[PDB]
């Protein structure tokens, strides 16, 4: 058990009662070391960890979709832990007041929560702290090497990131420990409710028969270990070779388990290295996985602004303020752009597909995020549109990985200088003719009409 995995945010009288694990980000019993130090933290007091989950009022921001695969994932998550001989909780509210009260009514001992990056749980964090009095601690159960560790400022560059990284992959990249057991209404209720709240904003084609298909999908910590395995055993050989193609979903579909915390990463990482492949494709899904998705925490939690024209780097901000005033070729509204009320198909299949699906493939993810930059007033507008679509329609989105995705498709975060062109100025490019090149766009346009 690595002590560096293990923050404290507050140092307080140490309680005498039940340890309380603040689920928020790692949805899942297996791999978690938020869990498994919090366990640890109760066998040496000889009390019984128990895990709290708080159900937010920002859910109605998002869809059906979210809020299904997340719920539909509790219910199996509340299975397993009773089999653990763990008891779970779900509040619905305001976190500040529902945590307050529960380390209260309950006599917690010590409370532990898993790390995210992101502004609203640092604000849930500030609420909590001002209303207790018993040691509060955190554990990135989220990245193989711990945010805080990994680097200690904003990094600008991948080729940057990937040493510091990789020289601290062997204390961190190690395997887990089983969760040895210990010694506010029912789920279907709370998912019927917010249903019917969410129901009249469900997102429909034309009339009455919704956009929405269910059924690629499975939620669940079991259905993601199927996801895996069936990646590494028939993907995984051609990973580097066809990530690019969005005609073929060679791609390991990972990404809405990921953000939910339904699978460990670090427990799709051992099973990648373990496993004979080809190595340049090896090479390329691990870097996505490590580098690509742990700068993303890094880029979140060392910029306060990370979802703010303020996070750019400086070339960009210069050179997009010198095209502020350029003729744009076309402007949309944020309406037009849900609906893919565009003049570029290819735009409107990348949306279709995200309607369709709730998730939209990682090529076309940057086309589709800097034609919004294309036809936007300012880049500011352009953030807020793109901000607005992912989290709304995006299964792994509201997501670190989602405000560092579309910050370097607008901003250029952690990319380069490209040629000067207007309106984009220096930001890379990506044409219409350019994807013809790479894939066979007619069939990604026909497969989303
Ligand atoms: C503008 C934009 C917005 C995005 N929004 C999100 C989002 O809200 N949530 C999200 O999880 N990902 C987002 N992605 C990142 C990336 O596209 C997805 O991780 C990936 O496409 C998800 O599908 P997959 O699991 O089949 O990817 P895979 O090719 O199978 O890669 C596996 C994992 O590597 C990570 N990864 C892959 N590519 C990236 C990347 N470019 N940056 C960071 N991590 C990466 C992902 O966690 C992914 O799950 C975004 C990308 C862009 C360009």
């Not at 949306?351 to 007033?377: C, D, P, V």
Request: glycine share 6%; proline share 5%; aromatic share 12%.
């Amino acid at each position: 058990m690595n002590p560096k995995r293990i923050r404290a945010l507050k140092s307080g009288k140490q309680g005498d009662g039940p340890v309380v694990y603040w689920m928020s980000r790692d949805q899942r019993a297996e791999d978690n070391w938020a869990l498994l130090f919090s366990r640890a933290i109760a066998k040496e007091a000889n009390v019984p960890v128990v895990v709290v989950f708080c159900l937010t009022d920002e859910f109605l921001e998002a869809g059906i979709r979210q809020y299904e695969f997340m719920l539909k994932g509790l219910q199996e998550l509340e299975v397993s832990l009773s089999r653990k001989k763990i008891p779970s909780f779900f509040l619905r509210g305001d976190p500040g007041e529902k945590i307050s009260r529960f380390v209260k009514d309950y006599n917690a001992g010590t409370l532990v929560t898993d790390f995210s990056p992101l502004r609203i749980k640092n604000q849930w964090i500030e609420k909590v702290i001002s209303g207790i009095s018993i040691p509060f601690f955190e554990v990135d159960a989220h990245n193989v090497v711990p945010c805080w560790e990994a680097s200690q400022k904003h990094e600008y560059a991948a080729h940057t990131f990937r040493p510091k990284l990789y020289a601290l992959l062997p204390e961190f990249l190690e395997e887990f420990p089983e969760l040895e057991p210990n010694s506010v209404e029912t789920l279907s209720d709370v998912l019927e409710t917010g249903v019917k709240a969410l129901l009249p904003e469900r997102a429909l084609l034309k009339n009455k028969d919704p956009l929405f298909e269910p059924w690629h999908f499975e939620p669940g910590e079991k259905a993601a270990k199927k996801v895996m395995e069936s990646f590494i055993a028939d993907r995984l050989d051609s990973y580097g070779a066809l990530r690019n193609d969005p005609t073929k979903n060679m791609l390991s579909n990972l990404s809405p388990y990921l953000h939910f915390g339904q699978i460990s990463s670090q427990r799709v990482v051992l099973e990648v290295e373990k496993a004979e492949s080809n190595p340049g494709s090896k090479k390329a899904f691990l870097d996505e996985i490590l580098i690509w998705k742990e700068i993303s925490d890094n880029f979140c939690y060392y910029n306060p602004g990370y979802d703010g024209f303020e996070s750019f780097p400086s070339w960009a901000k210069e050179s997009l303020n010198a095209h502020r005033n350029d003729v744009r070729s076309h402007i949309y509204t944020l309406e037009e752009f849900e609906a893919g009320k565009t003049h570029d198909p290819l735009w409107n299949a990348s949306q279709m597909e995200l309607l369709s699906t709730g998730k939209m493939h990682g090529y076309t993810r940057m086309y589709w995020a800097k034609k919004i930059l294309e036809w936007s007033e300012s880049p500011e507008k352009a953030l807020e549109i793109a901000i607005c679509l992912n989290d709304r329609y995006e299964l792994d989105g509201r997501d670190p990985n989602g405000y560092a995705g579309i910050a370097w498709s607008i901003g250029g975060v952690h990319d380069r200088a490209w040629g000067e062109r207007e309106v984009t100025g220096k930001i890379r490019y990506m044409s219409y003719e350019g994807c013809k090149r790479k894939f066979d766009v007619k069939l990604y346009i026909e497969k989303y009409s």
